[PDB]
Amino acid sequence: IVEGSDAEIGMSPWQVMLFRKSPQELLCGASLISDRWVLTAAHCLLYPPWDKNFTENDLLVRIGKHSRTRYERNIEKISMLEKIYIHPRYNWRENLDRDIALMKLKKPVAFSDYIHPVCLPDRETAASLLQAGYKGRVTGWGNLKEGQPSVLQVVNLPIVERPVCKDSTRIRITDNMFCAGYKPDEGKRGDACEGDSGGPFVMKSPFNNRWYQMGIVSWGEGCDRDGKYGFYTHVFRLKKWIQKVIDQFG
């Protein structure tokens, strides 16, 4: 996260770290959506241009974390993966269309002050809140500029009008994406960066005072560049697939 700040303790208790077993290293962010299911970006697991194609046994998830590098004894919980599910129409060839994946844990995780699931949006919450100018919150342990944080970083960013997102890039934008970030004339800054992939873009509903995950950190051109924006997977647009997977494999 570029131009963010240290998270408060328990500020993002759905935050998940995807961790490689050997060598032991951070791979991506992710989010906890129930006691058995973790949501991430498909490109965190499958990206052939970079020779990336992980299997369940390659990976761990670390839940309840704050420090990036420490083993947070008595706080974090480490879980093994039962199965990975990648969206069948994930487009890694062109523009990361439908950049979404689910991971089912081998055993349910116990909730605590530091571990708690985020909500997924309904159609009405998405229609109300996915509006240009409305801000969400992005969290992760990725790089601080286009270098690395001691603890989880957080930045609040406004959703951007779709024509502005389109006009910022030569990449083809789809309805399964939205973009967020400040404009050059807005003064303020901030973006996701390498290592924040797969983490959540959340919004706090003013109707029921609950946090909803509206986006997944997907792609950008650099980090925090003027006139560029970060692009996020549109979770609600892909929720029917989420539900199908959970209803049939859970």
Partner: peptide
């Protein structure tokens, strides 16, 4: 620069 995690998670 990561602290080693318990071996039980790597089995």
């Amino acid at each position: 620069d990561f602290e080693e995690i318990p071996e039980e998670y790597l089995q």
